[PDB]
Amino acid sequence: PEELKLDFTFDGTGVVPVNNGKPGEFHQDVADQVRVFLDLVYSMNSETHKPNFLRLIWGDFSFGEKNGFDCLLTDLQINYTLFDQTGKPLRAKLSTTFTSYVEQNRRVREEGKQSPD
């Protein structure tokens, strides 16, 4: 299986604009984003007893013969580097490692084995 490595940043000090078209708006809340991210990609699902299946998409990007990456999370690290006077964070840096996932039934169909069979 293929491996994927990604790094990104959350910033809430009020200098990065929000891409919604309103004038005077900047990003100012890190904790909410960390919370929704961890709930979506990391925690256990109460009905399946395991984490969720993920698909990664970036507009018109193509990995190959497909337009998305089907995966599971295997590694994550967060660094908090800037704090408010009440203790709430102002900047977080995240590093993640994903691995490729594809079902049995579909795998044997992708290998369209042609033989004297």
Rounded-to-integer distance, Cα 57 and Cα 39, Å: 19
Q: What share of the chain is helix, strand, coil (3-state, %, to 5)?
A: 15, 35, 50
Q: Contact, 10 vs 22, CB < 8 A?
A: no
Task: Select 37 or 93, whichever has its Cβ closest to another protein.
Answer: 37
Rounded-to-integer distance, Cα 62 and Cα 59, Å: 9
Tell me the backbone φ, ψ of residue 26, rounded to 5 degrees.
-140, 155
Q: Binders of another protein among 56-115, rule CB under 8 A?
A: 57, 59-60, 66-68, 86-87, 104, 106, 109-110, 112-114
Task: Select 42 or 95, whichever has its Cβ closest to another protein.
Answer: 42
4 to 43: interface string for another protein, x by CB under 8 A: ---------------xxxxx--------------------
Q: Which residues bind to another protein, rule: CB under 8 A? A: 19-23, 48-50, 57, 59-60, 66-68, 86-87, 104, 106, 109-110, 112-114, 117
